[PDB]
Design a protein around this ligand. Structure first.
Ligand SMILES: [K+]
Ligand SMILES: [Mg+2]
Ligand SMILES: [Mg+2]
Ligand SMILES: [Mg+2]
Ligand SMILES: [Mg+2]
Ligand SMILES: [Mg+2]
Ligand SMILES: [Mg+2]
Ligand SMILES: [Mg+2]
Ligand SMILES: [Mg+2]
Ligand SMILES: [Mg+2]
Ligand SMILES: [Mg+2]
Ligand SMILES: [Mg+2]
Ligand SMILES: [Mg+2]
Ligand SMILES: [Mg+2]
Ligand SMILES: [Mg+2]
Ligand SMILES: [Mg+2]
Ligand SMILES: [Mg+2]
Ligand SMILES: [Mg+2]
Ligand SMILES: [Mg+2]
Ligand SMILES: [Mg+2]
Ligand SMILES: [Mg+2]
Ligand SMILES: [Mg+2]
Ligand SMILES: [Mg+2]
Ligand SMILES: [Mg+2]
Ligand SMILES: [Mg+2]
Ligand SMILES: [Mg+2]
Ligand SMILES: [Mg+2]
Ligand SMILES: [Mg+2]
Ligand SMILES: [Mg+2]
Ligand SMILES: [Mg+2]
Ligand SMILES: [Mg+2]
Ligand SMILES: [Mg+2]
Ligand SMILES: [Mg+2]
Ligand SMILES: [Mg+2]
Ligand SMILES: [Mg+2]
Ligand SMILES: [Mg+2]
Ligand SMILES: [Mg+2]
Ligand SMILES: [Mg+2]
Ligand SMILES: [Mg+2]
Ligand SMILES: [Mg+2]
Lengths: 258, 184, 185
RNA sequence: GCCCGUCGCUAGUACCGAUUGAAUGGCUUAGUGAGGCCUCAGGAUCUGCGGAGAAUUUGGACAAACUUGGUCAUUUAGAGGAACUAAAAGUCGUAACAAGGUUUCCGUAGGUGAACCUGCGGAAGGAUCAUU
RNA sequence: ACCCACUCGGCACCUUACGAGAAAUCAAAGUCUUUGGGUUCUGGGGGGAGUAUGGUCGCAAGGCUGAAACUUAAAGGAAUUG
RNA sequence: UAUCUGGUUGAUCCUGCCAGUAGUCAUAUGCUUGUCUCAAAGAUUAAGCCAUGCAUGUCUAAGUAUAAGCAAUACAGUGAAACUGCGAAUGGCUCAUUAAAUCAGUUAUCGUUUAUUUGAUAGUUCCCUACAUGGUAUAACUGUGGUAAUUCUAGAGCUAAUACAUGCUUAAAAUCUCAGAUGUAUUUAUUAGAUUGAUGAUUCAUAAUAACUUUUCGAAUCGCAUGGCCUUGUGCUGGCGAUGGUUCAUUCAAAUUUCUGCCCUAUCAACUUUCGAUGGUAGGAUAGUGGCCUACCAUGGUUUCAACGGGUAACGGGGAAUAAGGGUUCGAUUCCGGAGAGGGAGCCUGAGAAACGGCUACCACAUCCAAGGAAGGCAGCAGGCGCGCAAAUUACCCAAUCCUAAUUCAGGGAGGUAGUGACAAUAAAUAACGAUACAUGUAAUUGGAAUGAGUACAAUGUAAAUACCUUAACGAGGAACAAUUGGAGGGCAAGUCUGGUGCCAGCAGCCGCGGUAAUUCCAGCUCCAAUAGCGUAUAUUAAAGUUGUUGCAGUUAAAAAGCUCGUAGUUGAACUUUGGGCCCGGUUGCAACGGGGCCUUUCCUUUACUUUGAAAAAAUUAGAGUGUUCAAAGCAGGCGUAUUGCUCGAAUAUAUUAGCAUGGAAUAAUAGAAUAGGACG
RNA sequence: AAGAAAAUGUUUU
RNA sequence: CUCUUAAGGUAGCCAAAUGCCUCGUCAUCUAAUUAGUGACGCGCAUGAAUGGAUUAACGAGAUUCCCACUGUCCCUAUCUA
């Protein structure tokens, strides 16, 4: 209505953020940025609600303006910067890195990682196109454009991004039997292996995924993120590895600690 | 102002639509350029997104392509002889896309002579090479004897401010000559 | 504006306002359990009806259904934890067969009587209200407390509240202050 | 016993109603038409044969607004008229309920203080399930 | 033409009602709380009222369509005893 | 949470409504009102009118500082003013319009624009400055003024830029034209983009050619550190950034867009079409598609499967109340979408507005005035008037939530805090226990205890408070620190008690009660019901199988059309692979049940329907866990300690319309070869 | 075979 | 119930070209109306082929209002034969 909205009412924020209902009338609206509004995690939320380093937004800004936080290797002093899937958030003080991956329940889990693999990050190839002057380029899920990609890289593949030079180091192909993260839908946060890809020309492509426990679910091609091969994920998986325990076995796991 | 909305312009059943949402800027129209001939005057229109259109009023010269030799020489527009959409545009010499104009033909004469040199209508041996391809349509070469080449406007002068076009050739040329002989 | 705050009713009034047998049974319950008004009985009946409805909706599903199993065992777990349900009869069809007195017994006001902390149910209610009873390290002045079957062994007088504590009270202090002169000095 | 209508008393509610009644809004015919916008120009005076150019101005399209006529929707005043309803104990008769004292009722038509009466056809919901 | 037997179709009738129904009664008014063969029309307490209004048909009488305000605790069906 | 009861009668069984009964985050009102938690609140009528005050401004190290401002060899800090930039298009409010419109779900952009963010990206420019151009420039400021008055401005004198306007340097390599041309941007034409990238698909991406531009970009910008080499000179190189910049991609978006779905009405049956209605061609216009508009043409387009018209005391949805099932009703209002800012219209700026705390005009209101003129828009926050049955402070604050800006700092009536507040919801004081006297109870026979309602040191809580939580002291005896609101014929719990009145007064939802022995009025006493609440009115839901699809009734209670025809609609006989067998194989405990495959003459059009899957925001609903002291709630929290901390969670189900994908092929429909114009090879 | 006239009754128990 | 001489003005209609009183009363039309129209009706003295009521069309008939129009007027002036 007359221009872009700048506010985000609470109860209109993404549910994954696990924001308190009766805290205020508003939630941090993710600024324009690499990933998305709904699919992102604002740095204020990651710093105050997931890690409890800052007590409020003022302390979040105090953290960010003294150049502690760093997203994908860059300082990113923006409080509502939309850090999203597979972004690397390194804090030099309290020296540690996190990889923004989805837990089994679909929330952006706090996933502590070491520097030797925080060096890079993975990116799903959103599109492959010819740029100006006939230069090919790859657009990844995080809005990155990388020129002169390997001529064998197609859409729905994954590329390992150096994150120091922003170049392609390795690339995984979307194919049957490759490890996939689910980055949307009901099965968000689940990890499995591709069983089949149904084409549906003009429609949406479907893909069948078998997790390690042999549970098979079908989801749209839009929200499957290749992360490697069976047993060999190119990233450090979170505590649950995308197993999707039912509520009964979850209760059994909880009550196994007595 | 002018609206391109469809909230007016009653529904396909014939029902008169009630009004809501008083005219919005993003559905505006503007007035036609009504490009004339001679004494170039180009006005800048600030369009949506900060872009810019060029209303060409009173355009004198444009770039016209032969498309048989791929030359696209700049020439002066003599006048308008035919308009499929409105004869009044011909009468008022309004420059508009798809308008059939007459161009001076002199730059084309010069290029043809300097390139092939075969007395079209009245480094040495390059014409020896490009002599077999020197024959052109009788209905095209006959226009040079009068110094007026028929052409069709392909740009939108009201949008881009240019009056580019192409020389009529072949079946298109024959069609427009038949219409000209029927209406003249 | 801020998100709305959810609130619910905790009771339900009877359909027939003047059923003589219902009125007599309610007054019997009020006398037996030292209740202030019929609203406490209404609240207990409302909770019991909610529990019975949940049990019926579970029973209408085929046995060994995941939802039936999960929510059922949750319901028995909660009921045996509060003490209303019997350890023996954990099959949810003996949840269907519960009664209001089962919930009225697990009240803190009822338990303060049943443990000898008070000489009447109404004395127990008064003792709870006047900040004399603690459950653990916590004074509880709510007569409807639903002792969790793990606080039953721990219900005792408070460190404050000079009946099981160490203080001299207030009216006793005033009586002693006046008796200092009343004795002659 | 019960009961029907006219006619009297009182109260209330709608309806009709001269006023070429009134008001409001939508749509609409024919007119007038501000204003900004595009455009034909125009050229204070600030300038270095050129440029920027205010007032002013041509023709357009968009059109507020007003007048007139029509239509619809909604509301509303009105001399007066004519019904209906209600209301402890009014007048006239007694039409119906019994074969209600002329069986009742329907349709239709006429008459008539009032219920009603009468003609023609019909029904039994009749006072006849019945005369080999 | 008649008599006997059978049959299809018809106007009906007698008995009993398994059944139905408030009952009177009903071979349908049955096969309806064990509620579904198909389908059309109509009713939603009594009045106001088949009135007002608009429409339409009619020469007219009128017909078809058709309210509301307001009013009211009954009106009504079948049967029982007087 | 599958329930009824009173009222037609002398009695009966019905029909049938009236009445009762219960709920309502459902309003209002009466009486009453002690405590804690939570907190709806000028929607309904008047999208009626508004005094006053506030609600939008914004500066970093990093655009412009000579304030004649403050401070201890160009300025160097701070920095009012102003120029520049950005924002002011978000928020907040309201529900007036609006009925295929909005909206919801689902689509599309191979039909477009997109400030910003993020990522990538620019050796090509010249026909006597680059060790850096101009005022074509001015604000602030100084000084001189006009007006009664406005956030009015004139004249005069300076001065800058990331304002405005100009304008070079980057060779090298490199192909065409006959020395020049070749970056990018625009426009046209042409070529390739194959069977040398992408798509289901393109005139796609992209490239190439020839040209074309009232010139687009290709930093004359800023901060901080200074380094290396060195002919140590006005040397050559060189760091981290800020800001700006073309194109592309991305993000925030926007605009159009597919399919299906809206309440009542026929006392609306034809509508649209001259003045665009439906389509075609061309053009114009637009950011772009499109009758969006124009010209010519064709006569189309919608409709009983309800068009069109009319009403709506209609914004749509998420949802709410009630609900055995099926439903009925509500949804101005916390979130989403739309629309509006007194009514219209027009427009500037800007990426984005047809903006209204922007402008212009008319209309209606309406304000100052010195009469010349000038100025307006509370459906933002308070507040006032009015309207009404019907709704609160002209309070405090940016501390939290977030937003904006040049931005850690400023601003924010957004928002939060408190005030008012029996909207609604949670919890639950008004007593408990002994001794005397009599028959577990009894009463003005008495005692020791207990404590909060308040009051208040303090502390905490808070942005500062208030209050809650915690507590020094005080603070019960008819504990007067005194609970009410409705009732006592029936429905319906509770009086054949007393006085009063005497068909009066009055009660009574309904039936009824009152006519001098009133269980019904007015009272006293006593009792009943609910109880910090209770009553009344209205609306609505259940009851209502009194709207009936489930599931009503139509002989006589209301209702079968006088009768038949007949189009739409609804419905419509049976029949086409059935049945043997051999296997493999999952689930329950060899049996049962499911599934898949082979033969058996067989092998693996169009629909409806049904399965399954993805989908249908959150909040709300069900629901798991979790001692907010319990609870409503909330999404918290839990674990042993003298740590330089470990850890579980914020699940799960549901919307069965429409669309998508998928298995089945019973049921129901549809089509085949008949003048063979048939099938197969 | 058949057999003239006959109107009315206040309101609440 | 009567009596004057039979009946006793029904349906309609009206201060009507029929109403004295009368410029009736009420409404409307106007600034103002003995006018007009619509009502009312114990109507001096309305009323049924001495026809009553109403009526589309028609009228050099009588009447009121409105729009247009104008020297009818305000207020006269001028020209031609
Ligand atoms: K009486
Ligand atoms: Mg939108
Ligand atoms: Mg009689
Ligand atoms: Mg008789
Ligand atoms: Mg008689
Ligand atoms: Mg009858
Ligand atoms: Mg009725
Ligand atoms: Mg009878
Ligand atoms: Mg009722
Ligand atoms: Mg207190
Ligand atoms: Mg209002
Ligand atoms: Mg907004
Ligand atoms: Mg292209
Ligand atoms: Mg076109
Ligand atoms: Mg609604
Ligand atoms: Mg409305
Ligand atoms: Mg709403
Ligand atoms: Mg409203
Ligand atoms: Mg909203
Ligand atoms: Mg707006
Ligand atoms: Mg207003
Ligand atoms: Mg506006
Ligand atoms: Mg305002
Ligand atoms: Mg605004
Ligand atoms: Mg008290
Ligand atoms: Mg009494
Ligand atoms: Mg009783
Ligand atoms: Mg019925
Ligand atoms: Mg009947
Ligand atoms: Mg019949
Ligand atoms: Mg048919
Ligand atoms: Mg069949
Ligand atoms: Mg009698
Ligand atoms: Mg008469
Ligand atoms: Mg008269
Ligand atoms: Mg008259
Ligand atoms: Mg006159
Ligand atoms: Mg006669
Ligand atoms: Mg006469
Ligand atoms: Mg004549």
């Amino acid at each position: 209505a007359r221009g872009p909205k700048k506010h985000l009412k609470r109860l209109a924020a993404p549910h994954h953020w696990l924001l308190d209902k009766l805290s205020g009338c508003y939630a941090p609206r993710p600024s324009a940025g690499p990933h998305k509004l709904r699919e992102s995690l604002p740095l204020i939320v990651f710093l105050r609600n997931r890690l409890k380093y800052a007590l409020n937004g003022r302390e979040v800004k105090a953290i960010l303006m003294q150049r502690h936080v760093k997203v994908d290797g860059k300082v990113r002093t923006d409080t509502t910067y939309p850090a999203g899937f597979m972004d690397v958030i390194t804090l030099d003080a309290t020296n540690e890195n996190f990889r923004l991956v989805y837990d089994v329940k679909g929330r952006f889990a706090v996933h502590r990682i070491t520097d030797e693999e925080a060096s890079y990050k993975l990116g799903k190839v959103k599109k492959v196109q010819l740029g100006k002057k006939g230069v090919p380029y790859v657009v990844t899920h995080d809005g990155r454009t990388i020129r002169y990609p390997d001529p064998n890289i197609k859409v729905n593949d994954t590329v390992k991004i150096d994150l120091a030079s922003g170049k392609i180091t390795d690339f995984i192909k979307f194919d049957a039997g490759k490890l996939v993260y689910v980055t949307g839908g009901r099965n968000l946060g689940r990890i499995g292996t591709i069983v089949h890809k149904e084409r549906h020309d003009g429609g949406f492509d479907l893909v069948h995924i078998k997790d390690s426990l042999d549970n098979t679910f079908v989801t749209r091609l839009n929200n499957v993120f290749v992360i490697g091969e069976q047993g060999k994920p190119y990233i450090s998986l979170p505590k649950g590895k995308g197993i999707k325990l039912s509520i009964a076995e979850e209760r059994d796991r909880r009550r196994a600690q007595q | 102002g002018i609206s391109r909305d469809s909230r007016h312009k009653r529904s396909a059943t014939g029902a008169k639509r009630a009004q809501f949402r008083k005219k919005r800027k993003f559905e505006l129209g503007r007035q036609p350029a009504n490009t004339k001939i001679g004494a170039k005057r180009i006005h800048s229109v600030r369009t949506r997104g900060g872009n810019k259109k060029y209303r060409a009023l009173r355009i004198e010269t444009g770039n016209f392509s032969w498309a048989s030799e791929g030359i696209s020489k700049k020439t002066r527009i003599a006048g308008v002889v035919y308009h499929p959409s409105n004869n009044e545009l011909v009468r008022t010499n309004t420059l508009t896309k798809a308008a059939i104009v007459q161009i001076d033909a002199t730059p084309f004469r010069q290029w043809f002579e300097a390139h092939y040199g075969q007395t079209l209508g009245k480094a040495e041996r390059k014409w020896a090479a490009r002599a077999a391809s020197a024959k052109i349509e009788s209905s095209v070469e006959s226009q040079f004897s009068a110094g007026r080449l028929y052409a069709c406007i392909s740009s939108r002068p009201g949008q881009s401010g240019r009056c580019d076009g192409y020389i009529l050739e072949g079946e298109e040329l024959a069609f427009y000559l038949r219409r000209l002989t029927a209406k003249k | 504006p801020r998100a709305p705050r959810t609130y619910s009713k905790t009771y339900s009034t009877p359909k027939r306002p003047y059923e003589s047998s219902r009125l007599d049974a309610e007054l019997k319950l009020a006398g037996e359990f030292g209740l202030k008004n019929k609203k406490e009985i209404y609240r207990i009946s409302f909770q019991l009806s909610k529990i019975r409805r949940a049990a019926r909706d579970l029973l209408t599903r085929d046995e060994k259904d995941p939802k039936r199993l999960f929510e059922g065992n949750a319901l028995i777990r909660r009921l045996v934890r509060v003490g209303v349900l019997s350890e023996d009869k954990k099959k949810l069809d003996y949840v269907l067969a519960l009664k209001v007195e089962d919930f009225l017994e697990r009240r803190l006001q009822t338990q303060v009587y049943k443990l000898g902390l008070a000489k009447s149910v109404h004395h127990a209610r008064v003792l709870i209200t006047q900040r004399h009873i603690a459950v653990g390290k916590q004074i509880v002045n709510i007569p409807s407390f639903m002792v969790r079957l793990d606080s039953e062994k721990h219900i005792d007088f408070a460190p404050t509240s000079p009946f099981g504590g160490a203080r001299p009270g207030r009216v006793a202090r005033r009586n002693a202050a006046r008796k200092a002169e009343a004795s002659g000095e």
